[PDB]
Ligand binder design. Structure first.
Ligand SMILES: Cc1cn([C@H]2C[C@H](O)[C@@H](COP(=O)(O)O)O2)c(=O)[nH]c1=O
Ligand SMILES: Cc1cn([C@H]2C[C@H](O)[C@@H](COP(=O)(O)O)O2)c(=O)[nH]c1=O
Lengths: 194, 192
């Protein structure tokens, strides 16, 4: 069971993924939670480079993918073979939305790199935490973080287009309150998982 | 002018590249010399990961390309626009030969990654320093370095196959002595 949380910065997806992780643990599932980029020693090194250094968009794409490849090989593939529920804070749709829709790189090229890095592993379900950019920015403002409105509008749109096209993507209204959002999440998971 | 040195570990390509850099500098060219992976601040961080850590082959592929992308964008493309002679100690054929012929990753997929990382920048000439694996291992043994014979035989073959197929790749007999190898390098360079 692979569960992917996706969406823009300020959508609450980190918080919600952690919330799901603790909920599923309590219900007796064996659960893993990983962030992208990161989630492995090598991954976190790359994550630090990605968040620190001034990188061109091609180099960035290759590093996000390298981080995913490490995660898939070292953690996710073994976890899944052990019937762990794997929860991801970002996955392959983040790359298409950010590097494709946002930075203008080729979407079919991105999808081939995603395939390559994941060895074709796909989520059972992707939760897209959709939120207006203005509301996301407000929320980040409270935690003292600032992101680019023009860029995030493209990204948001990208995500919503992917949720129509791609398989197994449910759109969550992440503008609501924390418990309300979480119960929408539990509803979209029902069926797929008890 | 972009000049790429390629070949297996122990072929002398590092030494020859530095020898060509100093030679062309003396003749009044404006020259750069970079190694792959590496050659930029970010690239050297990736290089250390690649040389230190236990990596699967797909992650390795992606990091070699990330390093290339950084190098291309930050240094090579600006160096070329300024008519510098850019000398590379390894480039795209090393990726195909090591990750493709050696580790078994798809060669066409590698060629597409190479294209993407380079923005299509291609050498004017590639010097393949071909050498028997046994001789290369003997030379590495003297500097106290040990590499995998089975793996390097596949890589050497891959290189040779690429020198037949790919454009502007000249095979140099890197088994000779230093000055003799450098003479063949200057000969091949006198074609471009
Ligand atoms: C996984 C991934 C993240 N990112 C970005 C989104 C965020 O701005 C940052 C990850 O941080 P966040 O989840 O901590 O907001 O990296 C990409 O641009 N592409 C990717 O493939
Ligand atoms: C540039 C490059 C090098 N390599 C290998 C060749 C060497 O073993 C090492 C580069 O370091 P060296 O040439 O300084 O020993 O990494 C690849 O496997 N793929 C690549 O794309």
């Amino acid at each position: 069971m692979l569960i992917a949380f996706e969406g823009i910065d300020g959508s609450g997806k980190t918080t919600q993924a952690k919330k799901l992780y603790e909920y599923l643990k309590q219900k007796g599932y064996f659960v893993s939670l990983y962030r992208e980029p990161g989630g492995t020693k090598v991954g976190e090194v790359l994550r630090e480079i990605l968040l620190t250094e001034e990188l061109d968009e091609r180099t960035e794409l290759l590093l996000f993918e390298a981080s995913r490849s490490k995660l898939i090989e070292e953690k996710i593939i073994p976890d899944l073979k052990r019937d762990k529920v794997v929860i991801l804070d970002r996955f392959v749709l983040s790359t298409i939305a950010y590097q494709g829709y946002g930075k203008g790189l080729d979407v079919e090229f991105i999808k081939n790199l995603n395939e390559f890095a994941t060895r074709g592993v796909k989520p059972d379900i992707t939760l897209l935490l959709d939120i207006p950019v203005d509301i996301a920015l407000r929320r980040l403002k409270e935690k003292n973080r600032f992101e680019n409105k023009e860029f995030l509008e493209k990204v948001r749109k990208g995500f919503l287009e992917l949720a129509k096209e791609e398989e197994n993507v449910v759109v969550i209204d992440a503008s609501g309150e924390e418990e309300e959002v979480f119960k929408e999440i539990l509803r979209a998971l029902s069926g797929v998982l008890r």
